[PDB]
Design a protein around this ligand. Sequence first.
Ligand code: ATP
Lengths: 58, 50, 505
Amino acid sequence: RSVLKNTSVIDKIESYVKQYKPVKIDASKQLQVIESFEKHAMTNAKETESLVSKELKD
Amino acid sequence: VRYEASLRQLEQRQLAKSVISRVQSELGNPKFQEKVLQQSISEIEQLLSK
Amino acid sequence: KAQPTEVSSILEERIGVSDEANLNETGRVLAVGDGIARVFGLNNIQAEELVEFSSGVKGMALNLEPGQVGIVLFGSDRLVKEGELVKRTGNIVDVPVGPGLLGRVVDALGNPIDGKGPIDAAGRSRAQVKAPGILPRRSVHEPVQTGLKAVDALVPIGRGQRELIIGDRQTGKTAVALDTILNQKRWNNGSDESKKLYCVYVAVGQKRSTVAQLVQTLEQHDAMKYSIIVAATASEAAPLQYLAPFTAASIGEWFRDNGKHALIVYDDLSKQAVAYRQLSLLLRRPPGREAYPGDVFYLHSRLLERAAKLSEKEGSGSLTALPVIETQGGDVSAYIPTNVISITDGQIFLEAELFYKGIRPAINVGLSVSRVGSAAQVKALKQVAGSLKLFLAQYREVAAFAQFGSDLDASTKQTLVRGERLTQLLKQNQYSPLATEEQVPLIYAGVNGHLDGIELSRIGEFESSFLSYLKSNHNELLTEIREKGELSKELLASLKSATESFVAT
Ligand SMILES: Nc1ncnc2c1ncn2[C@@H]1O[C@H](COP(=O)(O)OP(=O)(O)OP(=O)(O)O)[C@@H](O)[C@H]1O
């Protein structure tokens, strides 16, 4: 800022950045469809696991 | 900051053509006459140093 | 503002010098034609003393005679007029040295052309300083990490190892030392001065637009905070182009004698030889081979001898030199380069055909070599590139052998495929230096044949892919290569696993 001796905007853009210093929050939105994806995952996985654990000894 | 340095350089070149204006101010004087005595007393000062 | 008039008026106060202006030098100019001037008088002049003419142009009094003294000009003869008044400085030709020279762009005399005001000089130093003797030296033992692939792989550079870059016109020569300077940003951002390495680029006889774009580019990548540019462009006088590399060598000596480490880059000595034979022919001195005066070997000799590694008694300073020689059509038997080859500690030949094939850098490995670089290679690179030059010379043997279309055994075809992969490997775009930690895994993949199943065109994306792979994941191994510079067996096997993982894709 003190490099520009003709400052005139640096307070403006500095308080503009400090204004938007709370930029935007993130997106932790998925907690319902993602658990359905891993629900189908655990479903078909335990189907496969029980079937192969049976058929190996079979 | 780029425009600041640009404005400094424009100030410097406008003072260069102002140096031209100062030279044209200095040209028409009896400083041409008086300054001979300047050299006189000066050369006295230089050669009296030794 | 008026603060420039304030500073200039303090300089007007200095302009105090008029109160003690009894110069024991002033003499009339007898004649002044063909870039030279005979001056009567100056009977207490010194040999190779800087003088200044009445038209502001300075000059060096080079030959002394009973009756007159022949003084060369440092500019056009259009300013110097016959019969004028020639004040001597009182000095052998000296240039400003100091840390404030960094960032600035000057002439051959340290007068800045960047328009950034005066120079914060820490002193003045002579141009024709003696090179240091054999005792305050040390054999090189510290690397110069250029950031390029095949350069740091095959021709390592010691701090002070005088390595020639030789090539032809528009053959990527300037970009090599340019990207070397850009690699030095790694440690110039750092803090250890012995890790730091300061850059002086000497553009002589070239286009002012070219130098302006180069300085612009060095400001874009922010190399300017450790850069010093010496401009001796083609519009300027031949003695300026003669003189400027000696001045930059004095700057490098200023850095070296402060214990620090510094890099100078000459570009090019070829035009300096042109300027020097222009001088000597206007000195009416007889030429020798290819119309050069016979001392032109001594010229570049006495230039490049002022660059070495100081011992610990001197503070372990170093000064590494990168001369550039433009040849004519790939000739290595012209009189000028064969002199330089007899001086430097090795060669970096750039083949025109490889860059004509777009292979940038266009390194001919079979010609390019360093003599004592292996003593100061990075120890990990010394571990991993032992078979590499052997395998590349081997692939070069079957390079011209495979042009006949004859099928071969799996051994020579294996070397053919892997050498094709290594050849297409070592391309590298401009302004893209690579750290040593980045260069190690590409070599380790290239040695162990993992590239052979990969497509030849796929290698370029594979490089960046595997690098981003490791930087994402095996960042610890990158830090290990950074900290050690040397691969243990555990690091070797972990490196092997980390490679073969991404080699599975
Ligand atoms: N690794 C690279 N990536 C991109 N471009 C490159 C690379 N190497 C060389 N070039 C190209 O080569 C051209 C010549 O560059 P350079 O000036 O270094 O060659 P040169 O032989 O030094 O020419 P001169 O001697 O006239 O300066 C440039 O236009 C540049 O784009």
